[PDB]
A and B are shown apart, each in its own frame.
With several copies, the nearest count.
Chain A
Amino acid sequence: LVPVKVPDFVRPRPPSATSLPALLSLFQEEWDSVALEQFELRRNLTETK
């Protein structure tokens, strides 16, 4: 492998950013969005066959 360099990527952390929403609301939505997508993606693979 060969590592590449670029001008780096920047994400603007939201204005309502605290330990509280990042622990509770944001992290909850991320494991919801991972769960309901792959389940729905498994549903899409079953119908294609």
Chain B
Amino acid sequence: VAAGKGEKLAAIDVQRYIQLKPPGTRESLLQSAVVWEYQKSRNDNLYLLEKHGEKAFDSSLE
């Protein structure tokens, strides 16, 4: 933590999921299947937010 702050460099995260590529290989077959499950989790994660909608936000604003 002290080395990260002194050097002024944040540790690199997984820059993989966003880009990917069609006709890849067994490696991109995994990377593709990752994008589906997280996209389904995403679309389920946006459903439970919109159900309540702005009521849950303005309750925290109070």
- Judged by CB atoms under 8 Å, the answer to whether A and B touch is yes
* Interface residues on chain A, size class: 20 to 34
- Given contact pairs A35-B5, A36-B33, A38-B5, A24 touches B42 in the complex (Cβ within 8 A): no
Residues of B in contact, count (CB < 8 Å): 27
CB-CB under 8 A from A17, the residues of chain B are: 45-46, 49
Number of A-B contacts (CB under 8 A): 82
Q: Determine the main DSSP class of A at the interface with B.
A: helix
Q: Which residues of A contact B45 (CB under 8 A)?
A: 17-19
Known interface pairs A17-B45, A18-B45, A34-B1; A39-B6 also in contact (CB < 8 Å): yes
Give 10 pairs: A residue, B residue, CB < 8 Å, sorted on A: A10-B60, A15-B46, A18-B41, A20-B1, A25-B13, A25-B14, A28-B11, A32-B14, A34-B1, A39-B1
Q: Which residues of B does A touch, CB under 8 Å?
A: 1-2, 4-6, 10-11, 13-15, 17-18, 30, 33-34, 36-38, 41-42, 45-46, 49, 56-57, 59-60
